[PDB]
Amino acid sequence: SMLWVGVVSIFPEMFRAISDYGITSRAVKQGLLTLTCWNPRVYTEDRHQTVDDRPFGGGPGMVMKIKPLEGALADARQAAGGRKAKVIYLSPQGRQLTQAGVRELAEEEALILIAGRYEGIDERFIEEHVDEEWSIGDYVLSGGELPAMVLVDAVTRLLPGALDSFTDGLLDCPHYTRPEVYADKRVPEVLLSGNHEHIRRWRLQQALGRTWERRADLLDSRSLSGEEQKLLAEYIRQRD
Amino acid sequence: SMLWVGVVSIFPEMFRAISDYGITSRAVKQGLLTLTCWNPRVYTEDRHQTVDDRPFGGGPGMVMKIKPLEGALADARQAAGGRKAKVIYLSPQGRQLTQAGVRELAEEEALILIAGRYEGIDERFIEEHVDEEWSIGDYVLSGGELPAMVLVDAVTRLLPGALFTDGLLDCPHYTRPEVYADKRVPEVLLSGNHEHIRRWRLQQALGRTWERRADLLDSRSLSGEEQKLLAEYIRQRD
Ligand SMILES: C[S@@+](CC[C@H](N)C(=O)[O-])C[C@H]1O[C@@H](n2cnc3c(N)ncnc32)[C@H](O)[C@@H]1O
Numbered sequence: 488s489m490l491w492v493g494v495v496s497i498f499p500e501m502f503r504a505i506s507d508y509g510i511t512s513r514a515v516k517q518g519l520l521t522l523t524c525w526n527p528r529v530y531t532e533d534r535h536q537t538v539d540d541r542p543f544g545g546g547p548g549m550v551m552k553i554k555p556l557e558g559a560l561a562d563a564r565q566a567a568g569g570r571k572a573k574v575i576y577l578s579p580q581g582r583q584l585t586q587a588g589v590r591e592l593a594e595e596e597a598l599i600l601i602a603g604r605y606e607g608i609d610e611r612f613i614e615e616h617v618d619e620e621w622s623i624g625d626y627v628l629s630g631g632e633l634p635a636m637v638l639v640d641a642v643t644r645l646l647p648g649a650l651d652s653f654t655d656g657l658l659d660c661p662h663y664t665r666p667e668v669y670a671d672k673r674v675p676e677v678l679l680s681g682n683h684e685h686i687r688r689w690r691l692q693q694a695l696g697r698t699w700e701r702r703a704d705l706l707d708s709r710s711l712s713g714e715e716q717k718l719l720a721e722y723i724r725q726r727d
Numbered sequence: 728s729m730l731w732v733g734v735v736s737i738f739p740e741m742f743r744a745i746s747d748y749g750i751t752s753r754a755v756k757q758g759l760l761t762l763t764c765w766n767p768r769v770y771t772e773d774r775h776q777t778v779d780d781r782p783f784g785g786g787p788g789m790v791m792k793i794k795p796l797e798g799a800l801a802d803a804r805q806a807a808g809g810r811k812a813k814v815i816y817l818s819p820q821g822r823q824l825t826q827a828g829v830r831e832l833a834e835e836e837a838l839i840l841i842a843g844r845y846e847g848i849d850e851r852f853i854e855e856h857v858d859e860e861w862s863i864g865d866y867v868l869s870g871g872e873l874p875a876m877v878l879v880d881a882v883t884r885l886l887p888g889a890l891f892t893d894g895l896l897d898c899p900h901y902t903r904p905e906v907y908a909d910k911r912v913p914e915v916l917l918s919g920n921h922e923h924i925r926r927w928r929l930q931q932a933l934g935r936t937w938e939r940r941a942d943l944l945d946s947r948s949l950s951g952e953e954q955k956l957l958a959e960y961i962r963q964r965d
């Protein structure tokens with residue numbers, strides 16, 4: 488009940504992937520999350536009018552009509568009640584989702600997600616109704632249902648009582664479990680015979696070095712402390 | 728047939744979102760894409776089908792046990808047959824997925840995608856078995872299932888007959904009616920001039936990219952025409 492999510496999508500049953508499995512499923516059961524779907528085809532003027540129509544100016548593919556989406560939105564808005572509802576359109580043209588963005592969206596009382604299909608939705612719907620556009624990344628998907636699900640999953644993790652990378656702006660350290668030896672590779676001895684301060688310094692150093700190796704861009708936008716500059720310089724020199 | 732995909736996951740039923748819907752479901756039907764699931768819970772040794780284990784060095788959470796993962800991977804590789812399969816682990820620590828990455832992945836004949844759960848998987852498993860690590864973006868999800876599905880959806884779209892190419896954001900889209908609640912479709916699109924439609928679209932694409940994602944333009948080699956249409960878009964707005 489702490490977070491109310493409404494999804495506008497022509498494939499509402501596709502959302503069983505999050506309503507029936509994982510953290511999102513557990514959060515629904517616990518009442519932390521409320522999830523509802525709104526099929527635009529149930530909001531056409533008459534049952535003989537489809538959700539899509541030919542694009543103006545031509546070109547390959549079809550475009551989603553404004554009235555079905557408008558109908559679906561209005562109905563979802565009514566169901567949200569007395570909650571501050573943010574209307575998100577999932578689009579590659581939107582703001583890139585990051586852990587910082589996830590933390591913000593987690594503060595919202597209610598969210599209404601517009602999952603588009605075909606070649607996109609009519610600009611006039613975006614202008615009039617869409618509050619914020621959001622992208623899950625710089626790649627093209629066939630529809631906005633997996634992006635909407637990616638957002639719901641990321642946000643649900645932050646809900647209190649529902650349960651790290653980018654929490655500190657760094658990649659995570661490697662993880663190890665039983666047995667102590669597997670395929671001739673042994674667990675770093677510090678993880679087996681170390682104190683919490685040894686384990687903390689090895690984890691921060693591994694996180695810094697992995698970020699430096701793979702995602703240097705994450706460092707150019709992060710301030711390295713005295714300790715970190717030294718843990719990092721050491722990682723670089725001891726790499727292999 | 729064109730592309731074979733093996734998924735290592737403890738929630739294979741989540742993959743109904745791609746096996747039953749869209750281009751992926753169509754590609755399966757048309758035989759362009761083969762989609763299979765390999766559940767580590769089946770490759771267990773106990774009654775309760777334990778797939779997680781405590782982490783070395785303390786801390787909260789659990790790590791995925793190597794043996795159930797190795798088992799599921801082994802069987803996925805056997806089913807891949809004689810196909811050259813690239814083993815990918817979905818994680819926030821991986822190479823960031825972009826359209827250019829999608830095109831690269833679309834050249835592979837087989838993909839085995841490993842979907843993590845909990846706090847992650849054992850690094851020794853990754854160093855030994857994983858060819859490549861891929862992220863869908865700078866955020867943390869509860870599992871690798873949605874990222875694996877995003878990857879397959881993106882790649883399937885590039886399969887022939889399936890249904891950031893320009894390196895720009897796209898132009899707005901308009902459909903019937905001509906006029907809706909005091910808003911009307913740009914007249915250029917209501918005309919039949921295929922050259923004026925093209926020019927207007929390329930300008931709106933250049934313009935939207937300049938306004939929102941100037942980073943995509945800094946890496947782009949703008950043509951003589953493109954530099955003119957973009958300048959025009961900038962000078963002509965409030
Ligand atoms: C073929 S696609 C996008 C086509 C094109 N970029 C456009 O909108 O002009 C149709 C739907 O997929 C969704 N989508 C595709 N990629 C996405 C992404 N990377 N992030 C969020 N949504 C995406 C959007 O909801 C869009 O309506």
Ligand SMILES: C[S@@+](CC[C@H](N)C(=O)[O-])C[C@H]1O[C@@H](n2cnc3c(N)ncnc32)[C@H](O)[C@@H]1O
Pocket residue numbers: 651652659660662816817818819820841842843844845846847848861862863864865866867868869870871872874
């Ligand atoms: C809670 S996460 C683990 C995050 C953890 N900090 C780590 O060390 O990877 C569980 C699983 O989600 C998947 N995952 C989470 N975010 C992802 C992302 N942004 N890109 C690709 N996969 C992701 C991975 O398979 C990961 O093992």
